[PDB]
Enzyme design. Structure first.
Site, mmCIF file in Angstrom:
data_model
loop_
_atom_site.group_PDB
_atom_site.id
_atom_site.type_symbol
_atom_site.label_atom_id
_atom_site.label_comp_id
_atom_site.label_asym_id
_atom_site.label_seq_id
_atom_site.Cartn_x
_atom_site.Cartn_y
_atom_site.Cartn_z
ATOM 1 N N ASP A 1 5.140 -3.871 -13.050
ATOM 2 C CA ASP A 1 4.743 -3.965 -11.654
ATOM 3 C C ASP A 1 5.046 -5.369 -11.145
ATOM 4 O O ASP A 1 4.435 -6.344 -11.596
ATOM 5 C CB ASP A 1 3.261 -3.635 -11.501
ATOM 6 C CG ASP A 1 2.857 -3.409 -10.061
ATOM 7 O OD1 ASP A 1 3.722 -3.535 -9.171
ATOM 8 O OD2 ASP A 1 1.672 -3.102 -9.817
ATOM 9 N N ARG B 1 -7.625 -15.403 -22.632
ATOM 10 C CA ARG B 1 -6.390 -15.327 -21.866
ATOM 11 C C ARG B 1 -6.658 -15.580 -20.387
ATOM 12 O O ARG B 1 -7.776 -15.405 -19.893
ATOM 13 C CB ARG B 1 -5.725 -13.962 -22.053
ATOM 14 C CG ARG B 1 -6.468 -12.808 -21.397
ATOM 15 C CD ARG B 1 -5.775 -11.481 -21.666
ATOM 16 N NE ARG B 1 -5.731 -11.158 -23.087
ATOM 17 C CZ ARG B 1 -6.747 -10.648 -23.773
ATOM 18 N NH1 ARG B 1 -7.908 -10.385 -23.197
ATOM 19 N NH2 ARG B 1 -6.591 -10.394 -25.069
ATOM 20 N N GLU C 1 0.836 -1.200 0.000
ATOM 21 C CA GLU C 1 0.000 0.000 0.000
ATOM 22 C C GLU C 1 0.874 1.254 0.000
ATOM 23 O O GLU C 1 0.872 2.058 0.933
ATOM 24 C CB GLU C 1 -0.951 -0.018 1.194
ATOM 25 C CG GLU C 1 -2.147 0.912 1.056
ATOM 26 C CD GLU C 1 -3.019 0.575 -0.139
ATOM 27 O OE1 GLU C 1 -3.159 -0.625 -0.456
ATOM 28 O OE2 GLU C 1 -3.562 1.511 -0.761
ATOM 29 N N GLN D 1 4.864 -10.267 -6.924
ATOM 30 C CA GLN D 1 5.843 -11.351 -6.969
ATOM 31 C C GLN D 1 6.377 -11.572 -5.557
ATOM 32 O O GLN D 1 7.441 -11.085 -5.169
ATOM 33 C CB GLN D 1 6.957 -11.025 -7.955
ATOM 34 C CG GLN D 1 7.790 -12.223 -8.370
ATOM 35 C CD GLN D 1 6.950 -13.348 -8.938
ATOM 36 O OE1 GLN D 1 6.801 -14.398 -8.317
ATOM 37 N NE2 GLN D 1 6.398 -13.132 -10.125
ATOM 38 N N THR E 1 -2.101 3.842 -7.478
ATOM 39 C CA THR E 1 -2.440 5.219 -7.821
ATOM 40 C C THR E 1 -1.604 5.712 -8.993
ATOM 41 O O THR E 1 -2.133 6.324 -9.927
ATOM 42 C CB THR E 1 -2.247 6.125 -6.604
ATOM 43 O OG1 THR E 1 -3.193 5.773 -5.587
ATOM 44 C CG2 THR E 1 -2.441 7.586 -6.986
#
Ligand SMILES: C/C=C\C/C=C\C/C=C/C/C=C/CCCC(=O)O[C@H](COC(=O)CCCCCCCCCCCCC)COP(=O)(O)O[C@H]1[C@H](O)[C@@H](O)[C@H](OP(=O)(O)O)[C@@H](O)[C@H]1O
Ligand SMILES: CC(C)CCC[C@@H](C)[C@H]1CC[C@H]2[C@@H]3CC=C4C[C@@H](OC(=O)CCC(=O)O)CC[C@]4(C)[C@H]3CC[C@]12C
Ligand SMILES: CC(C)CCC[C@@H](C)[C@H]1CC[C@H]2[C@@H]3CC=C4C[C@@H](OC(=O)CCC(=O)O)CC[C@]4(C)[C@H]3CC[C@]12C
Ligand SMILES: O=C1CC2(CCCC2)CC(=O)N1CCCCN1CCN(c2ncccn2)CC1
Lengths: 336, 57, 286, 235
Positions: D81, D59, D40, D85, D45
């Site tokens: 991003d 997909r 977070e 992971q 954003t």
């Protein structure tokens, strides 16, 4: 709770059992064996065409066609005899760390930072490679995958779990848990029944495919294991780690047999493989070079220098005619 | 974290309950496999270029 | 007496050809040095190699013998080749400057529309200008006085051709390079200029170090180009317009001619043997 | 040699290699950015702010690595991003060696908040440790970092309510948005051990529809220009 207590007791007992079976090391047994001598391998073929760091390769069962997976979103099928690119599969995700070529040759696998195992049908009615299947369910990066057969595939991920998938059904037939670190390598046994997986907890684990439970655990390495490969007999395997060492463990003895390490190597091993007889252990290193060790002697039988960047992947044909090394310098080299 | 302790101890006892052979026997079997297939190992013994498919057709 | 100058010229010609061939080979056999800037540097090295194997041995032969015992047609061919290769070397310097200018002042062009096709086009335009300066004396703009003395191989001294060659081969290139590298200097300075006190002092020291580095690099480039070719082209522009009362010493003329020729030796040193990529590639080769 | 099958194979290989060269040329025109940060930390954003009106230039959902392709001022950016992971970073961070920049997003308002794993671990300290680790990897010696300090308004409200001394006990000064924000920016800047090779571009994420993407574009073009200057020897 108190369980941990007896747990470590069990650990000690296991060690004692191994200490009961360790009467004569492999170095002592193979002392009278004539040394292999210096191994002269020269680059036969140079497969060029990848435009980024190659992270995986896998030979075919015909020992002629191979597959190479690189970060240019490319899964290139190579005809190593003629250096002819049979296929160039565009990957939906360019972040690929593993690739597997099916034993039948009809399919090819890939996977990576996308937690998906993509199975591509090489042989179809129109001659065009399409995504036959996308196996999802892993919650970490797919580090290795190996076609168990034409329809089942064993894959290892970065969420510390392997998985046997049925490609036709599309979901995990079985899940192999127990590793406390990201599995980084996976080797299938010659008899297709077992498989060893090396993970980031500096331990290897022998699992039964059908039962789905950990047969054995081998804790000899000091750092995470990046490579693993069964001995051709199927009763032993070799693991390369970032401890700058390879280690040959035995399934039947349930303990480490040999340690292949030299003071001039401080870099980790990205890939290990055995020759057809199992006498030569070929390991790719981070020092831009590959080292061929005498598996029974732990002596460097040769050096496969010639890669500009780190040797990430390595593989010996099924007939053992040649060894192919991929590298981060975007080239493959067939050595023979 | 007590539920996983039972699974871990069960796995450890299962691993300890297997049958283990002497390291000498394993080394002997490994040597036997290496020497029996040494004639069929092209990397071990450099094959002549006449039948080498990566040098001469 | 002639042995000393013969061996000195031979050493110069050997060093030039060795350096240029080493640069060309390093670019050819290394995939690391296969971008647009290194392609232009390699074409400059190829041009200087041509200048060292086709012009500098014959120039040395003419210098040591003090006479051109090779014939009139060979003399004209070797003047045309010399003009072509030297103009191509100078305009390779300009092409490198222009590629650098586009890289510094246009990152969008650098990322999107910059391809090895651009390097090939720049090299083609360079050799085209070399040919456009070299061919006119073979099809015109020639005076009988050049054929008046068979025991000499001087270039055409026609006033029109003097202006044409001296301006389109060095002076227009000189102003082009000066403008491009001045704009590059302005861009570099703009990029460099743009406990807390210790961090500010470290930033200021880094900025002054980078300013000194850019001043040194531009000085090396432009000073090598100037001290090599400017005396020669000043002489080649002044002498044809001053027939009398401007006698030139033979020794000074030879020194200035070979100062011009030494640009082919210095170009691999300025553009190839100074950046880190070439040094790493040569170390890996050797 | 002269057999029909061999000629067909060579022609197929040549066509495949031509397509490979075309794909490589197309992929060399795109700016690769590695998006990093805490859970977070305002990463979503930033992603939403970039793909407002310019996006993508049965997909299965991957959930492994997110791709965000957007074009700004005729420059193509792919942003990776890797926040989902959940694994050992050193086993896959080398895959991103060669990105133009690392967009590192940290929430300014998480200085008061602490990680759910343990109370005695600030979220800001975890973000700082991640920034120190990523700014000094062997794979990112020359890779610049575009640092985004998200949630400036929430941070301002929090420092109006709660003091900043809890996050930085060594910090001493008046509690205001300017001073505290500058202190956090300087603390993140000082983590750069590779001061000479790389630069950190710090921006306070704002609600304007295009200033964040404008800052990313300016930082990327500055990185490209400075890399070219280094190639010439002027930097
Ligand atoms: C009084 C106060 C202050 C002033 C006093 C003193 C300080 C300054 C004096 C004036 C300067 C004179 C020349 C200085 C050159 C010098 O310092 O060179 C440095 C040292 O390298 C070697 O020594 C190794 C180079 C080996 C070259 C090859 C040798 C063999 C050549 C023959 C070829 C045939 C045989 C191979 C290396 O280079 P550098 O420090 O000059 O700095 C830069 C250089 O100027 C840029 O051009 C270069 O960019 P490029 O254009 O792409 O090449 C940059 O990458 C960078 O190298
Ligand atoms: C043998 C013939 C071909 C003459 C060769 C001349 C070169 C050896 C000279 C000519 C111009 C000189 C340059 C003129 C000015 C500068 C800038 C000068 O910049 C600095 O770093 C000084 C400090 C500062 O600028 O703040 C460094 C030396 C340098 C590169 C000089 C290096 C030596 C050069 C290239
Ligand atoms: C750029 C850096 C690496 C220095 C380059 C040095 C050259 C510009 C020098 C080195 C040897 C010099 C040569 C050494 C000796 C002679 C012979 C000399 O012969 C005469 O004196 C002829 C006139 C006469 O005596 O009648 C004319 C100059 C020349 C060619 C010199 C020209 C300039 C040279 C090539
Ligand atoms: O040494 C020789 C002999 C040749 C014939 C064989 C090799 C050369 C002929 C010869 O004249 N000289 C003396 C040199 C005079 C100056 N050089 C340098 C290049 N020049 C130039 N370059 C671009 C544009 C205009 N001019 C003119 C020729």
């Amino acid at each position: 709770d108190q369980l941990r207590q007896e747990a470590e007791q069990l650990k000690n007992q296991i060690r004692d059992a191994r200490k009961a079976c360790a009467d004569a090391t492999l170095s002592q047994i193979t002392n009278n064996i004539d040394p292999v001598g210096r191994i002269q391998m020269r680059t036969r073929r140079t497969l060029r065409g990848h435009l980024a760091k190659i992270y995986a390769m896998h030979w075919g069962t015909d020992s002629r066609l191979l597959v190479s997976a690189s970060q240019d979103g490319k899964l290139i099928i190579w005809d190593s005899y003629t250096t002819n690119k049979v296929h160039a599969i565009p990957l939906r995700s360019s972040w690929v760390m593993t690739c597997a070529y099916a034993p039948s040759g009809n399919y090819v696998a890939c996977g990576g930072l996308d937690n998906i195992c993509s199975i591509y049908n090489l042989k179809t009615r129109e001659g065009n490679v399409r995504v036959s299947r996308e196996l999802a369910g892993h919650t970490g990066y797919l580090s290795c995958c190996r076609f168990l057969d034409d329809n089942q595939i064993v894959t290892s991920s970065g969420d510390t779990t392997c998985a046997l998938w049925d490609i036709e059904t599309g979901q995990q037939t079985t899940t192999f848990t127990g590793h406390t670190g990201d599995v980084m390598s996976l080797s299938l046994a010659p008899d297709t029944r077992l498989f060893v997986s090396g993970a980031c907890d500096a331990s290897a684990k022998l699992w039964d495919v059908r039962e789905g439970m950990c047969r054995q655990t081998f804790t000899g390495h000091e750092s995470d294991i990046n490579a693993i490969c069964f001995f051709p007999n199927g009763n032993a395997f070799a693991t390369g780690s970032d401890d700058a060492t390879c280690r040959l463990f035995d399934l039947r003895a349930d303990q480490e047999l040999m340690t292949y390490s030299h003071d001039n190597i401080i870099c980790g091993i990205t890939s290990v493989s055995f020759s057809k007889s199992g006498r030569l252990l070929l390991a790719g290193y981070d020092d831009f070079n590959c080292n061929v060790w005498d598996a029974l002697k732990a002596d460097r039988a040769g050096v496969l220098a010639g890669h500009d960047n780190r040797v990430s992947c390595l593989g010996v044909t099924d007939d053992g005619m040649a060894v192919a090394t991929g590298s981060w310098d975007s080239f493959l080299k067939i050595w023979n | 974290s007590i539920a996983q302790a039972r699974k871990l101890v069960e796995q450890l006892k299962m691993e300890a309950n297997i049958d283990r052979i002497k390291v000498s026997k394993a080394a002997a079997d490994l040597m036997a496999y290496c020497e029996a297939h040494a004639k069929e190992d092209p990397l071990l013994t450099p094959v002549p270029a006449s039948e080498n498919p990566f040098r001469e057709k | 007496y002639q042995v000393i100058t013969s061996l000195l010229l031979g050493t110069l010609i050997f060093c030039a050809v060795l350096g240029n061939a080493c640069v060309v080979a390093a670019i050819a056999l290394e995939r690391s040095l296969q971008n647009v800037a290194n392609y232009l540097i390699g074409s400059l090295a190829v041009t200087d190699l041509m200048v060292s194997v086709l012009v500098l041995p014959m120039a040395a032969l003419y210098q040591v013998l003090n006479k051109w015992t090779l014939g009139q047609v060979t003399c004209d061919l070797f003047i045309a080749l010399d003009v072509l290769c030297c103009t191509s070397s100078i305009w390779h310097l300009c092409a490198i400057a222009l590629d650098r200018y586009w890289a510094i002042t246009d990152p969008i062009d650098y990322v999107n529309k910059r391809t090895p096709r651009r390097a090939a086009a720049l090299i083609s335009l360079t050799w085209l200008i070399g040919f456009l300066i070299s061919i006119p004396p073979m099809l015109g703009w020639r005076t009988p006085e050049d054929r008046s003395d068979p025991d000499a191989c001087t270039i055409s001294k026609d006033h029109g051709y003097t202006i044409y060659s001296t301006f389109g081969a060095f002076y227009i290139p000189l102003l082009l390079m000066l403008v491009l590298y001045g704009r590059i200097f302005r861009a570099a300075r703009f990029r460099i200029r743009k406990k807390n006190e210790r961090n500010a002092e470290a930033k200021r020291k880094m900025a002054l170090a980078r300013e000194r580095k850019t001043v040194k690099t531009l000085g090396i480039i432009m000073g090598t180009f100037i001290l090599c070719w400017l005396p020669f082209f000043i002489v080649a522009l002044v002498l044809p317009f001053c027939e009398s009362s401007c006698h030139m010493p033979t020794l000074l003329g030879a020194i200035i001619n070979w100062l011009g020729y030494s640009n082919s030796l210095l170009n691999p040193v300025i553009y190839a043997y100074f950046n880190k990529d070439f040094q790493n590639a040569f170390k890996k080769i050797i | 040699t002269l057999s029909a099958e061999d000629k067909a194979a060579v022609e197929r290989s040549k066509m495949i290699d031509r397509n490979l060269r075309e794909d490589g040329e197309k992929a060399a025109r795109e700016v690769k950015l590695l998006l990093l940060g805490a859970g977070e930390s305002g990463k979503n954003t930033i992603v939403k702010q970039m793909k407002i009106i310019h996006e993508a230039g049965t997909r299965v959902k991957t959930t492994g690595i997110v791709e965000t392709h957007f074009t700004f001022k005729d420059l193509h950016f792919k942003m990776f991003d890797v926040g989902a992971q959940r694994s050992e970073r050193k086993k896959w961070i080398h895959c991103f060696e060669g990105v133009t920049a690392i967009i590192f997003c940290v929430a300014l308002s998480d200085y008061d908040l602490v990680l759910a794993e343990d109370e005695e671990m600030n979220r800001m300290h975890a973000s700082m440790k991640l920034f120190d680790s990523i700014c000094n990897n062997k794979w990112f010696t020359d890779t610049s970092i575009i640092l985004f300090l998200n949630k400036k308004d929430l941070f301002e409200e929090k420092i109006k309510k709660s003091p900043l001394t809890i996050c930085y006990p060594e910090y001493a000064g008046s509690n205001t948005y300017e001073e505290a924000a500058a202190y956090i920016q300087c603390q993140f800047e000082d983590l750069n051990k590779r001061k000479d090779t790389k630069e950190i571009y710090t921006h306070f994420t704002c609600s304007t529809d295009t200033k964040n993407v404008q800052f990313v574009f300016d930082a990327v073009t500055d990185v490209i220009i400075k890399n070219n200057l280094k190639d010439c020897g002027l930097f």
